[PDB]
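Sample 3 of the quickstart, ligand flavin-adenine dinucleotide:
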Amino acid sequence: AVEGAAFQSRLPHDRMTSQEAACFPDIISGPQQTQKVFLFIRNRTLQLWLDNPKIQLTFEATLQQLEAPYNSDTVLVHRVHSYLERHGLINFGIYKRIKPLPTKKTGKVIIIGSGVSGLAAARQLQSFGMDVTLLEARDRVGGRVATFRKGNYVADLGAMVVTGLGGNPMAVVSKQVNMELAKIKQKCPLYEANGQAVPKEKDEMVEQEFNRLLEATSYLSHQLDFNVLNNKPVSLGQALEVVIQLQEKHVKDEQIEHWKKIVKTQEELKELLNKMVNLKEKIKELHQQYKEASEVKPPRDITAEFLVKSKHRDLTALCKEYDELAETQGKLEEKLQELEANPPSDVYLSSRDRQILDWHFANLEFANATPLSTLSLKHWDQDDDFEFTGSHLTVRNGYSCVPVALAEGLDIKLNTAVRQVRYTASGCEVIAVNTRSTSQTFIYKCDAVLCTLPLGVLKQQPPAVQFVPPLPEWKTSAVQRMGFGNLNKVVLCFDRVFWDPSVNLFGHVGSTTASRGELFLFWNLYKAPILLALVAGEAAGIMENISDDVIVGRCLAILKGIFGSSAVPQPKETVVSRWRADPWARGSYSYVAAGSSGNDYDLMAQPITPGPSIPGAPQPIPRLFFAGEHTIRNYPATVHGALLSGLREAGRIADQFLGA
Amino acid sequence: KRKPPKGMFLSQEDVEAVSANATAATTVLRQLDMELVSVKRQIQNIKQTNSALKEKLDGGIEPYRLPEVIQKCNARWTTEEQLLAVQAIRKYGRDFQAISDVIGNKSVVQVKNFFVNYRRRFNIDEVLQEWEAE
Ligand SMILES: Cc1cc2nc3c(=O)[nH]c(=O)nc-3n(C[C@H](O)[C@H](O)[C@H](O)COP(=O)(O)OP(=O)(O)OC[C@H]3O[C@@H](n4cnc5c(N)ncnc54)[C@H](O)[C@@H]3O)c2cc1C
Ligand SMILES: Cc1ccc(-c2c(-c3ccc(C#N)c(F)c3)nc(N3CCC(N)CC3)c3nccnc23)cc1
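Result:
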């Protein structure tokens, strides 16, 4: 009901967020009754916007549809509505405006980059009445949302999945944009060396082992505190080795305990056999002796009779004794025939197995766009608590539709590469050049800069962008500490659909471990006959130094040895992403590197406040603001996270220069 | 967290063991590899030896057993049976089971009986101290 809207906005329906504590200190510290009133007004306003995000939810309309005792306090309602709208929880994206834009504007903001985070801020700021200009190095909007288009071919080289609509702000964007969303059939065959579908029985043992191995590292981390080793911090990959090794050690340990109890039994038998030989020997004599004593025929005295009767008793004693020893020798003889037939597993994982496991690892390198040797063991999964609900979707018609949509109405300067950012007590100048002719230079002066430069660009060892004054250590160190990963695609365009049209994805299992990322996964998502080949893990970095033709070579091979050397045409069109080489990206997206933590994401997001111009003038206003995928702790490395960070900075900038 | 997945093994102990240096891993694994071959070949050995001992038993104890009649237990001590007795007491001491098996028609009952009925004129005390000399 109303409680569903809170969930769709990533908010608890039943308590107040620490954000809200900050703007409604009255409420949070007050009567629990009013808190419930607040929460209901909040939840109901959210519901109203969410139920029709195609048009602006004015304060009028909100109080109108408020019922019961709640439209009683109209100042409280106007408060809640404004809070929601400043922070971008309602009237965000592309809506029809009701109250039209301010005639005269207030403040000026330069936004660096028109990726989704830049664009989202730009729209918010513009709807708050500010003057917004975006500077974009590329000749297109969208940044790392990059759709390839030619004829009817269409293929995302950047973001391509909406990872669930439950609580995803792109839920709202897709209601607002012609966004053609398609469920992903989440079954995926695996094809090996010479080209053989992996038996389903196998696929599932390895997958189950993969997952068991992950939980193992989590226990290895949280329970045993296996987090520092040799003064460096432990990576996920390190911990995976250590877990795998310990499983091999335990396999050997069991073979030892087994054969070691075969030998204990073999030595028990031996001890018995000996008693039994030295009874056969002892009995042999007793026979001879009894036989000789029987040679003395029975006209015989009593000592001679005692020696016949004695040797006889003696002889049948040693005879029972040896018979019980030869039943004990039969119980032993079979206990040992069983152990010889109950041998623990010969291996932990076979070679065929460990290469299928290596594909499940490449799948994990692909999601986190980086080698598992770089991910923090302790923190690599720290955003997992915040997963959306529902199926994962692809954008059938190209994700670029979203940026292009957001860009409508905005002042976007393309082919403008920012070079230096200057921020002072009085304001800022951004210096940019024309990417076509390097020499043509531009000076933009503004009240505030929103930096949405990719983490990979901010990381560039010889700076691609100079900050004046330089960013403080707390910010640069966060920048050095987290990872910016990599992940590339091959797009294959054909005349005839020759794959199985009912399968969305399917795998290729690498020969070696090193090459587990190399073209390990294939996507069929689009109308046209298009196939996408991912290059994940350590392959991505390397495959970029290989010509386009070789890459598509290796590609058509893999497909031929899977579909038949004859069903596989040449491709009409090929593209090969190279994100690490792209100078407006320098990689694909961020990842919590070993030694980092989601705390660095928050450091990324703190605004910078220049010092006073005149000595002893009061401490200024903050002037440099950061948004972007790498600035949002709970949703890094996604589009919704970019968008959220844009909405965040917009509200914060407006709170600063227009007051709250 | 909590306790490791079921069937993974991750003792504290082990982890320092495979981490404390760079090849401490493929060492602890190689030394177990060998302690295996070691124990396997010492099974090959006790098998060869047990196989030989088995040859020396071929025949069992078959041409060596003697039937053990019946002798329905009586109760009169014939002069023969007393003389067997006193000789069994010198060969066996108190193994009243063997002593009854030698005599044949006396059971551990009268064997214990006799021991004190005749204890005097068969100088049974002296006889037993002879067996104790052992
Ligand atoms: C291969 C790949 C696949 C992905 N797949 C998915 C997916 O399936 N789902 C998902 O949710 N997310 C996905 N992502 C992540 C998502 O694409 C990004 O997190 C998000 O689009 C980036 O938004 P941003 O606004 O922070 O940065 P960007 O979109 O990179 O925007 C930054 C902008 O700044 C510009 N710029 C750089 N330097 C300068 C300069 N000197 N002057 C001016 N402008 C400059 C850049 O050209 C760019 O336009 C993927 C990313 C990659 C690389
Ligand atoms: C079929 C399928 C495959 C992968 C995912 C997936 C992705 C993903 C999707 C598409 C592309 C492309 N092209 C891509 F590159 C990454 N990204 C995930 N991450 C990024 C790191 C962040 N820390 C947390 C969210 C993620 N997380 C959990 C589960 N599935 C995913 C979803 C569906």
